[PDB]
Write a protein that binds this ligand. Structure first.
Ligand SMILES: NC(=O)c1ccc[n+]([C@@H]2O[C@H](COP(=O)([O-])OP(=O)([O-])OC[C@H]3O[C@@H](n4cnc5c(N)[nH+]cnc54)[C@H](O)[C@@H]3O)[C@@H](O)[C@H]2O)c1
Ligand SMILES: NC(=O)c1ccc[n+]([C@@H]2O[C@H](COP(=O)([O-])OP(=O)([O-])OC[C@H]3O[C@@H](n4cnc5c(N)[nH+]cnc54)[C@H](O)[C@@H]3O)[C@@H](O)[C@H]2O)c1
Ligand SMILES: OCc1c(F)c(F)c(F)c(F)c1F
Ligand SMILES: OCc1c(F)c(F)c(F)c(F)c1F
Ligand SMILES: [Zn+2]
Ligand SMILES: [Zn+2]
Ligand SMILES: [Zn+2]
Ligand SMILES: [Zn+2]
Lengths: 374, 374
């Protein structure tokens, strides 16, 4: 009965940077060819969503943000073959078109149809499916999950197990998969190795999970908020350090602790200084450092390339290096089979209507993941 | 007999930066325990030696430079087991102690006994075997090949094929092995790939040789000196481009040429700007860039970490990633078995007494490798 019709529903609209979300009615157009309209069930609050508010991440405004979610297909546009109405699905903030040079490459996942490099805030066809107060509203990363209903391109949705608990598996849409893949896929952490993880939020805890899964002997968590240490130890940290406790820079402390540098380091914060510190603290001849955190818009870091000439490897990744549409259903299946845990990331649950409280919890330092229910 | 005695011989002493070498008599002490004294046969002129003259590289002066050589063992100190008097040998500017965490690591080569990071310009025991006009003279990288005789620590020498032509295989001591290994071992260039090589000197040409041996389909040479293009094509470059011919930055040109970025790029110059250009021209999701060129002392580059967050890998290496004492004898064996060529790198052969003329050929752009013969 809603198929082919505009849906009026509530969404969280961001009209201006550095302001609360406005929970208000929007109009959601029906899906066009190769589009899917989804009734959202659950969405996480990721620090990247907060970056849109802060202006750390620049995307066109006004916008419907949100990218870490799961829901149920309401309708499909003409030509959709990969999902049907009533399927559980995860929107993919990194698409998988399956046709570009990246999608065809065995190690590529940053599909060329993404809306991350140079955000337009549209559907693939350059238009918007959202109206609010009679004004067009931007999409975000082709997902826009802070809405009771969204419309996504087919290449930005994956069908998942019909028995999935959506209020848990929404974390597979960003923070778990990112952190876990950054360790197991991107860094390829080895058994018996020493790892350092900068930032112990939902993504850095997920990095720890992956390092533990990979068999690391030592996993050193690094955060300026010591309240984050207990959960980091629960999921696999062997020791935690707060840079503020030390007179010396933490790259020197970590080099000492690891008897000459760590095997693998991860930046999971989004600071230029900790990206350089994390590179420096990995062993100079064979160490690997992975950037996961989102840097502030248009800012350059400064570093000495001798850090690389000695033998270090420096890399970054989006979404843990996972090809998104292939990987999300497998990761859900693996969760179903208890191959990893999501509950340690979930610290708070709120209704969608309390989104602003959920952001307040992230900004205060209290939460890891708040899951919003529609 | 010379064994156990001070040798008075000829050497090229560098008394201060930005001056010609002084060809004069030095005294060479006999080797102490675990040291080897070598009669030099041939040495190449590597740009890194020029860096010591120019102040691009800081190392204690006065000094006997030179690091790309081969010779014949004159005598051995107590406890040497790996070479004997009369053996052909290559001094190793990156040692292989075999005992440190790097030497024990399957992918490490930058042995902690090296004299590159924080140069002392001595033997392992912190003393010098060289004097000139009554003054102690520094070693360089544990090698000091610009001398009729040197003394090296055993961990800094490899025994090579007794039938080796030392006037050719001296290039395995630095420039061939560095470039070749940078392609085949550090980048791991793939069959069918597209590579970009910045800098078409002896090292860059050896990178091309490696990229061709690895089966690359396209190898784009980049140099501001178009006189370097003909030899680059002879050894495998499919295209050459001079940045100076273009209105656009060369990263844009190379991105366009490669239909979205190269698979592998190499910086083989030693400039901060070309290190960032080389990173940028590799494909953003799966590209790999390797820094080979030695940067100027204490200078930082500026870059946008989004270049890495999309998926690029950035790495550097010394000596092509090769564990030096294991690798150099095998490389010489492979050359003897016609597995690669060295003659394309040798443009000039001069007596040692013409060292200054050899440096002038390098600085003017004319030469690739000048070999000095003792
Ligand atoms: N690459 C991707 O695909 C991807 C995916 C998800 C998130 N992100 C980014 O990853 C980062 C972490 O996200 P999250 O886990 O949701 O955020 P979060 O919950 O804010 O966690 C960040 C942690 O960093 C800690 N921190 C802040 N400053 C410092 C400091 N100077 N030193 C040490 N610790 C410090 C902070 O206390 C917090 O616990 C953010 O920048 C996200 O935008 C990237
Ligand atoms: N990593 C190692 O182990 C290692 C070993 C050997 C050499 N090196 C370094 O590698 C670099 C190359 O050494 P080499 O081949 O003997 O030197 P070289 O013979 O001077 O070659 C450098 C080339 O770069 C070209 N060039 C200069 N500026 C530019 C520019 N802006 N854009 C493009 N091309 C440019 C120049 O014309 C020349 O052909 C030097 O910095 C060495 O110190 C490092
Ligand atoms: O948290 C995932 C995430 C990113 F990794 C980004 F790089 C980005 F720009 C963004 F908007 C985003 F949501
Ligand atoms: O050409 C080899 C070479 C290097 F790669 C350096 F990094 C360096 F400092 C040096 F002195 C050297 F000779
Ligand atoms: Zn694609
Ligand atoms: Zn996210
Ligand atoms: Zn060693
Ligand atoms: Zn050299």
């Amino acid at each position: 009965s809603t198929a082919g019709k505009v849906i009026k529903c509530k969404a969280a609209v961001l009209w201006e940077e550095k302001k609360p979300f406005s929970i208000e009615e929007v109009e959601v157009a029906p899906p066009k060819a190769h589009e899917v309209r989804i009734k959202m069930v659950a969405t996480g609050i990721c620090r990247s969503d907060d970056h849109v508010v802060s202006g750390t991440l620049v995307t066109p405004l006004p916008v419907i943000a949100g990218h870490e979610a799961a829901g149920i297909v309401e309708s499909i546009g003409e030509g959709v073959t990969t999902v049907r109405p009533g399927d559980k699905v995860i929107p993919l903030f990194t698409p998988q078109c399956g046709k570009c040079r990246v999608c065809k490459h065995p190690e590529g996942n940053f599909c060329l149809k993404n809306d991350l490099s140079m955000p337009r805030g549209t559907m693939q066809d350059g238009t918007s499916r959202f109206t609010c107060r009679g004004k067009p509203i931007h999409h975000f990363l082709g997902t826009s999950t802070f809405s009771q209903y969204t419309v996504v391109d087919e290449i930005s949705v994956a069908k998942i197990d019909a028995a999935s608990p959506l209020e848990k598996v929404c974390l597979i849409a960003c923070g778990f998969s990112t952190g876990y893949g950054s360790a197991v896929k991107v860094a390829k952490v080895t058994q018996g190795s020493t790892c350092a993880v900068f930032g112990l939020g939902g993504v850095g805890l997920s990095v720890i999970m992956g390092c533990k899964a990979a068999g690391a002997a030592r996993i050193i968590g690094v955060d300026i908020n010591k309240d984050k240490f207990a959960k980091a130890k629960e999921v696999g940290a062997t020791e935690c350090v707060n840079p503020q406790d030390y007179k010396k820079p933490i790259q020197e402390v970590l080099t000492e602790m690891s008897n000459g540098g760590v095997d693998f380091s991860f930046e999971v914060i989004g600071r230029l200084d900790t990206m350089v510190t994390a590179l420096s603290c990995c062993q100079e001849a064979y160490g690997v450092s992975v950037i996961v955190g989102v840097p502030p818009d248009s800012q350059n870091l400064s570093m000495n390339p001798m850090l690389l000439l000695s033998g270090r490897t420096w890399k970054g990744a989006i979404f843990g290096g996972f090809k998104s549409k292939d990987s999300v259903p497998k990761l859900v299946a693996d969760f179903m089979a208890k191959k990893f845990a999501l509950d340690p990331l979930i610290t708070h649950v709120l209704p969608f209507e309390k989104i602003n409280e959920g952001f307040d919890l992230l900004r205060s330092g209290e939460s890891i993941r708040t899951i919003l229910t529609f």
